[PDB]
């Protein structure tokens, strides 16, 4: 296969971020040849919008999801992966990745200007499809989980230099002060968390290009190793996926 769209062309309007398209042919066709052999995968991941559900008038809330404005421009998207597709003893498909891309977009919440940076995760992913191999596009399914680390690393040094593995251990500027309240900030904490994501295929085609669909994930915001508790998040978008083993 080969119609070359040079990096020279793309550097112009930012296409990288938008995953490749699958326009007309709607042939959810892809065989049981799996039962016959194995398959790997290369997947593109892109979103359309982010959602921060923050609201604190406790006991009187059902659903509080506000839209969001991108401060970190054309960054999100970027997710170029490799993953293997397996068949389990019950006819379903499971996913397991190799490179593990991740990103750091920041969003400004209308309401308070309160900026919220989330680490967009897909790392350590695990995937699943419902019943069988007889159909694909018709009934589209793929769902699994994430592992979400922390926006910042042990080496990150804050305004007064004091973290895990480096940085002072105290508030130097105020020697003879109370350590209690400041404790919170003078000690950094590393958080690893819950990941949830789901997929829906709207276009499958030919024999080479295989998937493309509706994105939808839910992770947690950055807490700064010991600051305000994380505001919850929900992400939605589009995606691209190719496959072929023999």
């Amino acid at each position: 296969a080969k119609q070359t769209l040079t990096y020279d062309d793309i550097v112009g309007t930012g296409l990288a971020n938008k995953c490749p398209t699958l326009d007309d042919t709607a042939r959810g066709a892809y065989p049981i040849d799996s039962s016959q052999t194995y398959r790997i995968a290369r997947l593109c991941l892109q979103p359309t919008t982010f959602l921060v559900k923050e609201e604190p008038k406790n006991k009187r809330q059902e659903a509080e999801f506000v839209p969001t404005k991108l401060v970190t421009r054309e960054t999100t998207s970027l997710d170029q992966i490799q993953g293997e597709l397996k068949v389990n003893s019950d006819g379903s498909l499971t996913f397991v990745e190799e490179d593990g891309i991740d990103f750091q977009p920041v969003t400004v919440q209308m309401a308070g200007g309160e900026r919220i940076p989330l680490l967009f995760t897909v790392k350590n992913l695990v995937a699943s499809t419902q019943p069988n191999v007889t159909s694909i596009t018709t009934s589209t399914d793929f769902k699994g989980e994430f592992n979400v680390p922390s926006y910042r690393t042990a080496n990150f040094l804050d305004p007064k230099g004091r973290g895990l593995a480096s940085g002072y251990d105290s508030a130097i500027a105020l020697p003879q002060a109370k350590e209690e309240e400041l404790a919170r900030a003078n000690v950094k904490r590393f958080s690893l968390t819950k990941g949830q994501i789901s997929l829906n295929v709207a276009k499958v085609d030919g024999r080479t290009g295989e998937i493309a669909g509706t994105f939808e994930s839910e992770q947690l915001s950055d807490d700064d190793m010991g600051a305000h508790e994380p505001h919850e998040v929900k992400i939605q978008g589009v995606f691209y996926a190719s496959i072929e083993p023999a």
């Binding site: 991108l70 920041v106 200007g113």
Partner: peptide, 11 residues
């Protein structure tokens, strides 16, 4: 060249 001013203001 950018989008929202919330962006601009940040960069």
């Amino acid at each position: 060249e950018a989008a929202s001013l919330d962006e601009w203001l940040y960069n």
